[PDB]
Structure formats: C-alpha cells, structure tokens
C-alpha cells in the first residue's frame, strides 16, 4: 500500500507521543485537512502491531463530539498512518500551563466535558487507561472551547464494572492505586485520573509528585494528597469534595463518571 503517501500531503508537526509523531496533513482530492498520527513500524514487534490495530478498532467504535474521530488507518512499507480529524487548539496541557490554572467555573466546564467523553467510553465498555492533559485536545483556543479525548493507544475493552489485570500501563502521575498495587482493575481507573486532572485544573500542579518515582507511587497508593494554602483557600469545599470522591483509593468506593456528572459543583450552575 502507498494509499497514504499519494492521497495525502504531509504538513507541520502538531505534537509527539512516546514513539509517534502527529503531523497536519491535507487530503489531495478535497483539500481537507486532517491530523496524521505517524508510527514507524519497522521498529515494532508483533504485540505492538496488534496494539495499533486495537487502537484503530476502538477509535472507530466510539462516536462522540468530545472524542477524536478516526478517518483512516493506512499501513505502508515502514510506516502506519492513523488519520484523525484535526483539532486545532493544542493540548489541554498547554492551555493549563499557559493560564496556570482555571477558574472554578472554567474548570467545572472543562471537567464536565472530559467526564462526558470518559462516561461515553465506559457505557460503551471501554477503559482508556491514559487520561491526562496531554491526551485531551481543545477544539480551539477560546475560553470554554470543546475538549476532545485523544490517544486510544492503551484503551481496552471491559464489560460493566468487571475488573481484571490488564497489565501495568498508563502515565505515572495519573496511575491509579489498584494498577500500582497490581490488583485487577477496570473503568474506575479513568476516574482516578480525572480526579488528578481536576486537581491540576484548579491549582496548576498535581496532587501526587515526587522526584523519586518509588515515593510517587507510594504516595498514590496511599492516596496521600492535601490542599496546601494559600492556593486552595479560595477554592470551594464543594470542588474539593468532588476531587476527594474521584481520588478514593478503593476503586469500589470510587465515584463513577455517571454520578460525577451529577455533582453539585458541576451541575449547580
């Protein structure tokens, strides 16, 4: 197949993952623009290939305005191309760094959209496993712009509230206690990560952090976080409450996305 190289012109870099690069591209026949996630595949093992197919398959199964849309999946000689609709506002990560933190209003709006994209995965039997601000993209730079869930590279399927050992994977600061404890897990891990994200939205830094990654994981497994003054003095108890429910160490006790979209701090507006 040369199906990509002669149907698309590649443009500039939009971002980078662990071993992928995402470039803007333009379909030649139409002049329509897309984001091409490019993976060098001569490097890859059989398992990795399967993960790529799984990523494509799961993306397609999801249709939501807050989930990125996969337009094509093309395998060439030394490269695989996943062509997605272009989301032009950059990563949520960049916006938080750019603004330092979101007001309680903006943060509420933002986490509402994230939780909606997550709950959509969950009701469709998918756990993403890698919720973080780098994998959430903004429809544009404008306050309250639409947030889109990206990066289904680690996503897997699980039914309902079932939990099994799906392996050690995710992003360190966002990893849940049950993954770190190597206990069986399920959809609940994404809510933990959303709890981390919401804390980040509110003060601009994460609740779990250490230069020593061993201590980091220990802090996470213990659920050891606080709300340091003065950053958190202005923040309402109602918001802190929601973070606390999302950051509940025992996944069985943990709030679900469905009943998180009910929380007063998100709804009482």
């Amino acid at each position: 197949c040369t199906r990509f190289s002669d149907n698309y012109d590649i443009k500039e870099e939009l971002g980078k993952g662990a071993f992928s690069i995402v470039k803007r591209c333009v379909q030649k026949s139409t002049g329509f623009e897309f984001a091409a996630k490019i993976i060098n595949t001569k490097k890859l093992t059989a398992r990795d290939f399967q993960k790529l197919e799984r990523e494509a398959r799961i993306c397609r199964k999801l249709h939501h305005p807050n989930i990125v849309r996969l337009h094509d999946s093309i395998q060439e000689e030394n490269y695989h191309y996943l062509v997605f609709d272009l989301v032009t506002g950059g990563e949520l990560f960049e916006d938080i760094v750019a603004r330092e933190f979101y007001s309680e209003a903006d943060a509420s709006h933002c986490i509402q959209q994230i939780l909606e994209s997550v709950n959509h995965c969950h009701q469709n039997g998918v756990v993403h496993r890698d919720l973080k601000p780098e994998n959430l993209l903004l429809a544009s730079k404008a306050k309250g712009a639409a947030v889109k869930l990206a990066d289904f590279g680690l996503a897997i399927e699980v039914q309902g509230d079932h939990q099994a050992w799906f392996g050690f994977a995710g992003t360190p600061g966002y990893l849940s206690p049950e993954v770190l404890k190597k206990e069986p897990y399920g959809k609940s891990v994404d809510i933990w990560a959303c709890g981390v994200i919401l804390y980040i939205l509110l003060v601009g830094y994460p609740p779990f952090w250490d230069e020593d990654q061993h201590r980091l994981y220990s802090q996470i497994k213990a659920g050891a976080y606080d709300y340091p003054s003065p950053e958190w003095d202005t923040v309402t108890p109602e918001a802190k409450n929601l973070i606390n429910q999302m950051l509940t160490v025992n996944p069985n006790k943990r709030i679900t996305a469905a009943e998180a979209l009910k929380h007063p701090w998100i709804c009482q507006r």
Binding site: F93, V97, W165, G167, A169, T171, W209
Partner: peptide, 15 residues
C-alpha cells in the same frame, strides 16, 4: 511539585 509532561508507559503483564 509542578505541571510537567510525562511519558506514557506500557510494561504489559496482562494475564
């Protein structure tokens, strides 16, 4: 503690 990028890991081990 500060907001910095973090790379995704996958050490597998699924059973």
């Amino acid at each position: 503690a500060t907001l910095a990028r973090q790379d995704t890991i996958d050490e597998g081990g699924e059973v």
